[PDB]
Design a protein around this nucleic acid. Sequence first.
RNA 1: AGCCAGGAUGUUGGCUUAGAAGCAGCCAUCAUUUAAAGAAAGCGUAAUAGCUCACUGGUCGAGUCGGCCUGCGCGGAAGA
Lengths: 141, 131, 163, 176, 38
Amino acid sequence: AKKVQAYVKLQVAAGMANPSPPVGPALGQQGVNIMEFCKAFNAKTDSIEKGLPIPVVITVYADRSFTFVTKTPPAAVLLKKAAGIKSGSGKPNKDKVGKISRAQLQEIAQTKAADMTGADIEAMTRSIEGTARSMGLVVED
Amino acid sequence: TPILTFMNKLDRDIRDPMELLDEVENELKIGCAPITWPIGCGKLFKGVYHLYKDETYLYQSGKGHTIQEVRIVKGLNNPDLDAAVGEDLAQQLRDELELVKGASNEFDKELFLAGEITPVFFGTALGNFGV
Amino acid sequence: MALNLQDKQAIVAEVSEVAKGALSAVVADSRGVTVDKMTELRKAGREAGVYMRVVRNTLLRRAVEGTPFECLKDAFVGPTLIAYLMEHPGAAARLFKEFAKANAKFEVKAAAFEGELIPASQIDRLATLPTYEEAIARLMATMKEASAGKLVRTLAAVREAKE
Amino acid sequence: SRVAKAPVVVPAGVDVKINGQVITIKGKNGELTRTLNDAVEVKHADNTLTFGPRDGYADGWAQAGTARALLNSMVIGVTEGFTKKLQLVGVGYRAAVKGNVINLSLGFSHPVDHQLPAGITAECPTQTEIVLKGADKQVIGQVAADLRAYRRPEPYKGKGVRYADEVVRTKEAKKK
Amino acid sequence: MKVRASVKKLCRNCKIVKRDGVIRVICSAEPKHKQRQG
RNA sequence: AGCCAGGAUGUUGGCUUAGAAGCAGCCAUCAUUUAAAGAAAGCGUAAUAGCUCACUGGUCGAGUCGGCCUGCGCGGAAGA
């Protein structure tokens, strides 16, 4: 690694790659084409499923296109498919909204293997211990 | 269709005429063949040195309504170019001209008619100099 | 913070990693970056862990003066900026390499490896440790004795001696 | 206090012509150079210069620290001499130096020739840089400030004569 | 600058020195914090 | 006090969000990585930013910080 050369992260869902209405002319402008950011993305995105957040770095030089290497997704968006309601925050901690305990989201703290600055396989559980409290979801743990 | 190139507005503070050649070759996909070359720009525009005639036409300020007096300084190393232009500016002419020869083109009439090099003139249509 | 009640703390608490210390390394980190903690702490993921600490405590007056647990020749071993490192579990091998094959790649000065405890000496790195659990180094270590050490010379008179 | 207390140590060279209340230092380069003092009694002694107050002076120390300071830059003065450097920003700005008088061109309707002081010389490694060395810190500092003056750096495009140790604010126009 | 009866340091890089019989405020960050008299 | 270094990772935090990935914003401020790093100070984003602050290390080495009680002064303060 080095530091910073060129990279960002703006996206709404994997259910629909390279969105046209959303970001539009706001998905790379320094060596990033808009009709090419769907030939290197769905090259492995269609290898798991479509409908979940997929951020990623953007290694840029000066040779026509570019190169990227994404990783584990956010454990906050997984609360629309693996937890409860469709939304999230909205109603923070003013009235016990959804409720997730020790059991749920358990293995969701097991998906980020290499991407988890929580050496202690057990302690790394305290990290995501909040990726489901940004709206108030008491744990029945 | 063949293209002559005129670099207008040397009365103004401009970009590096080297860099100007890059932008013309790179972005317009056509070779540059300098015929004249500016000596100083803006408040320091002194005139243009003709590369092929080997002489220096001297710019006079504000005669843009008629044609100014044609005032030539013959040699490129003529110590009157130093006197008329200041030896400082005179050397930068000599320096740039060195680099120009290693990164540009000789005007070829055949390639011009083929639309593959442009004769580049530097001047100022307002000062009526270079036209 | 806190005075003596806190000073004494950083001492004994970490100086336990000296009495019962596996290996030992003293590396300054002038111009260190965060990757500094994204390395010895990253390699702690799928090949190490919370079994390693480099608590920069070169407070000398605290670190050095704070080592009554027999570590002589150290009244010198504690110069300028420092960042001691120690082990509790695991062997006393590898570790030296995490530094030797990192700081060697720029990564700030490496105190030229001033050496630390265990044998208790001075400066001039070694590496007879990381060769451990690489048993196959003890395998070919016999150089097939009869074989290889033979097929390398006793049969070099043909590909290098027929003139 | 402090800066005052701290000794000055006269390097291998400089003579130190301490005459009562008039000190003079000469060495390597720098045509000597000498200043005066007041409420600070300075003592040569051995291989240094000590600075202290004087009875009946509330200025003591305060006048002594500036003492140290000055002398300390007087040693190094003739020793390593003193640096400088300025760089002209803006299309059409050009320095020259064709003697000991610098000839600047800054978009005015005229040139601006500026004659260097006593023991100060300068060179123009580039048509847009000026490095002027000297042994008197107090004068290079000036000559620099003075050159710069002709055309300080405006906060919009940044054009003008800046140092290098600058910062140049620079901000946007009033929106539409 | 601004001459007020009460100077006051506003910013963190705003200084306060006394050049002559006058207390002034020298704020290195924002010029608007430059003040005299006080 | 200078001077020398770091200030992230879960996280682009979700959210009335056209787009917000710490900072016009809402509600929240918890947990690792560590010597220290706040979903956090400021400049300023089309938006990331680049780049600097609390706090920890290093260098230097004796004092340093701010309130309280008192004495004497400074500005505030322009006229025929």
